[PDB]
Amino acid sequence: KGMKIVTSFYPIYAMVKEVSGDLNDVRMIQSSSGIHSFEPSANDIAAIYDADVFVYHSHTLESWAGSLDPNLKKSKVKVLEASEGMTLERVPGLTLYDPHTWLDPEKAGEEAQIIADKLSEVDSEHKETYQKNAQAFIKKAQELTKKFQPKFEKATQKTFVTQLTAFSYLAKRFGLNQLGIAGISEPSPRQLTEIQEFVKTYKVKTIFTESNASSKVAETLVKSTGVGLKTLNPLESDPQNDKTYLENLEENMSILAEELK
Ligand SMILES: [Zn+2]
Ligand SMILES: [Zn+2]
Ligand SMILES: [Zn+2]
Ligand SMILES: [Zn+2]
Ligand SMILES: [Zn+2]
Ligand SMILES: [Zn+2]
Ligand SMILES: [Zn+2]
Ligand SMILES: [Zn+2]
Ligand SMILES: [Zn+2]
Ligand SMILES: [Zn+2]
Ligand SMILES: [Zn+2]
Ligand SMILES: [Zn+2]
């Protein structure tokens, strides 16, 4: 029992719980369905306003976080932006940035260090603990990287196609390249030829889709490309299981390393 913390979505909950080292109680706004386009409910906003601290990933994703001001209401709350001053990257083809930072383990460690630095500024008593826990995270996240950097170096092919384009940072970590499919749901006889040419050019043996994807899109994908489907998890929603955040990242990069080697 300590500071009452409430987080936006899963990865923030996980990072705050790993940095806090169970020093205090942490909760998460239960974001039904999508977190990428979601404005909070009455209970959620009222409960974050009655909490010791509420932390969110970035203003480029949780736009509704900047609409808060405890000074003009119940002001028990400290609003922390876990990714303040991080180096995000514009989206190709165009100001909009790609907020999917947390999928890169080293960038996840960067965000965890920021979280620890901002949480020790609010909880002096236990700063030595925060800085400690985070510094262990950085180590693990580092080890993980060194575990996969070589097998992705030996990787024959370094490109993967996905229905969910949320892995730019994970790809840049290991020198890979992600691409997207240009057919969504009933494709034309011309779009079919184009997709065949695309699958040929890039020698695509498998198309990746969001975890718990819809069946209607998977069916048309398999029918249009002619290849099987594997699953990648953006961790936008807590996959209820007993695995640690870095283990959930290792899962994604294991799937990738198997497909590419
Ligand atoms: Zn208290
Ligand atoms: Zn989604
Ligand atoms: Zn997303
Ligand atoms: Zn910001
Ligand atoms: Zn950075
Ligand atoms: Zn001290
Ligand atoms: Zn404390
Ligand atoms: Zn490195
Ligand atoms: Zn399903
Ligand atoms: Zn869990
Ligand atoms: Zn491991
Ligand atoms: Zn899993």
Numbering used by the authors: 30 to 123, 136 to 226, 230 to 305
Task: Quote the study that presented this structure, word for word.
Streptococcus pneumoniae scavenges essential zinc ions from the host during colonization and infection. This is achieved by the ATP-binding cassette transporter, AdcCB, and two solute-binding proteins (SBPs), AdcA and AdcAII. AdcAII belongs to the cluster A-I subgroup of SBPs, consisting of a conserved structural fold of two (β/α)4 domains connected by a rigid α-helix, with the metal-binding site located at the interface between the N- and C-terminal lobes (Loisel et al., 2008; Yukl, 2017).
In this study, we investigated the Zn(II)-binding mechanism of AdcAII by mutating each of the four Zn(II)-coordinating residues in the SBP. Structural analyses of Zn(II)-bound AdcAII variants revealed that specific regions within the protein underwent conformational changes via direct coupling to each of the metal-binding residues. The binding site mutations impacted protein conformation and interaction with Zn(II) to differing extents. Quantitative in vitro metal-binding assays combined with affinity determination and phenotypic growth assays revealed that each of the four Zn(II)-coordinating residues contributes to metal binding by AdcAII. Intriguingly, the phenotypic growth impact of the mutant adcAII alleles was, in general, independent of affinity, suggesting that the Zn(II)-bound conformation of the SBP is crucial for efficacious metal uptake. Taken together, these data demonstrate the importance of SBP-metal complex conformation for bacterial Zn(II) uptake.
